[PDB]
Design a protein around this ligand. Structure first.
Ligand code: HEB
Ligand code: OCA
Ligand code: 6NA
Length: 393
């Protein structure tokens, strides 16, 4: 069928171990052919850094309109000029300057979460820390109560899940799970939107209902698209940033110790986690016209999957591509994308990661619980684990 290839795993990724560390496979594929058509998924894969960046930089050539006849009327799936107008509503809300005032409060949220576990021998960094903290932050930004964090996590995670394979049964099981998260989350936000239409508040949702574009209010679908995209993007990725950073720091305790002993290295650590364990592995696009990249001729309308996970380790751009380095003078990864769709939340994600890692490090040395069976999140464009247990020494 005409299915989104970014939800369907490559055939080159087979075992669970490979899902937990697919980067050697991506590097082999990059070397064999940095651009290849995958007949199992009816798409091109692009693995090299230069071409990924070129795709993201050329929205006129590679369109973001890739909704799978799905309910995603958000800027993520829009092209200029509509993308420009809707994004200009929110861009000033997510700058470094706009968020600086949240620093103390995010530190307070992290302190409170680590207090719920101080007297716990071992704990799940996902359930007890990395999961809650991003959800709490984005809910306060949106103006939405989320006191049942586990409920919203479940359905937010649903909207990112992919297919086990390219079969018909796997795709149907995937759409069933995605549809459940749409029902609850669309419904919840429709109710909050109606509540804000009746009585405005000092929150993002209320601002979106007052804002005018081309002399008219936003459609309900458009406000809903903002609400869900901001919710899901705001928490699912950031949780994997924190978890993946804690994963690497308990796989390589040398790095953990170094950064704990020189806390000014936390920003580099955040960037290197994003490069080395990118929460988002692949970004989709649709060819807007025929495009000749190499010898490879991309025909208008074909799916084009750009692998940030591979671009981040392209040795043509990165020294020591497969080594975790906390002393890099620059780190031009594409884990937040590039160009007009560049991650709106990157300053917020970077602040949350910086505070999350700092609070963990300051609480002392910590180790992974050995003899656990890690479970990768079931989505091929995501990289993270469902659970990750650690303990303080
Ligand atoms: C708050 C909020 C938020 C947050 C926190 C975030 C966080 C994040 N994120 Fe973001 N993003 C977002 C919001 C967000 N986000 C949005 C809204 C978007 C869309 C934009 C446009 O489209 O323009 C993005 C976008 C984006 C992109 C691009 C895509 C394309 O190109 O298409 C990427 C890659 C990302 C990633 C990410 C990560 C990795 C993280 C963590 C770490 N993001
Ligand atoms: C983080 C990926 C984008 C999430 C927003 C799209 C919601 C949906 O699937 O309907
Ligand atoms: C938060 C947006 C990540 C990009 C997901 C995709 O391109 O399918």
């Amino acid at each position: 069928e005409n299915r989104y290839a970014n939800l369907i795993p490559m055939q080159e990724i087979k075992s669970v171990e490979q899902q937990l560390y697919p980067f050697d496979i991506y590097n082999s594929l990059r070397q064999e052919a940095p651009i290849r058509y995958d007949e199992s998924r009816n798409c091109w894969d692009v693995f090299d850094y230069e071409t990924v960046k070129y795709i993201l930089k050329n929205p006129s050539l590679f369109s973001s309109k890739r909704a799978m006849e799905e309910r995603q009327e958000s800027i993520l799936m829009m092209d200029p000029p509509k993308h420009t107008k809707l994004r200009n509503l929110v861009n000033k809300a997510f700058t470094p300057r706009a968020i600086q005032h949240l620093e103390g409060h995010i530190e307070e949220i992290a302190d409170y979460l680590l207090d719920e576990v101080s007297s716990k021998e071992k704990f799940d960094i996902v359930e007890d820390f990395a999961g809650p903290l991003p959800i709490i932050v984005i809910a306060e930004l949106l103006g939405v109560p989320i006191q049942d964090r586990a409920l919203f996590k479940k359905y937010s995670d649903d909207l990112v899940s992919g297919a086990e394979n390219n079969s018909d049964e796997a795709f149907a099981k995937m759409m069933q799970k995605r549809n459940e998260g749409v029902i609850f989350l669309q419904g919840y936000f429709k109710e909050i939107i109606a509540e804000r239409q009746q009585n405005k508040q000092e929150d993002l949702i209320s601002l979106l209902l007052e804002a005018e574009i081309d002399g008219e209010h936003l459609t309900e679908e458009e406000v809903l698209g903002f609400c869900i995209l901001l919710l899901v993007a705001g928490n699912e990725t950031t949780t994997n940033l924190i978890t993946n950073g804690v994963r690497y720091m308990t796989e390589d305790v040398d790095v953990q110790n170094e950064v704990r002993r020189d806390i000014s290295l936390v920003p580099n650590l955040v960037e290197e986690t994003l490069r080395y364990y990118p929460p988002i592995q692949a970004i989709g696009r649709i060819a807007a016209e025929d495009v000749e990249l190499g010898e490879c001729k991309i025909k208008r309308g074909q799916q084009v999957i750009s692998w940030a996970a591979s671009a981040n380790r392209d040795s043509a751009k990165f020294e020591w591509p497969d080594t975790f380095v906390v002393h890099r003078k620059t780190n031009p990864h594409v884990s937040f994308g590039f160009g007009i769709h560049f991650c709106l939340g990157a300053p917020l994600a970077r602040m949350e990661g910086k505070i999350a890692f700092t609070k963990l490090l300051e609480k002392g040395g910590f180790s992974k619980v050995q003899n656990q069976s890690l479970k990768p999140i079931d989505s091929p464009f995501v990289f993270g684990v469902k659970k990750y247990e650690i303990a303080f020494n």
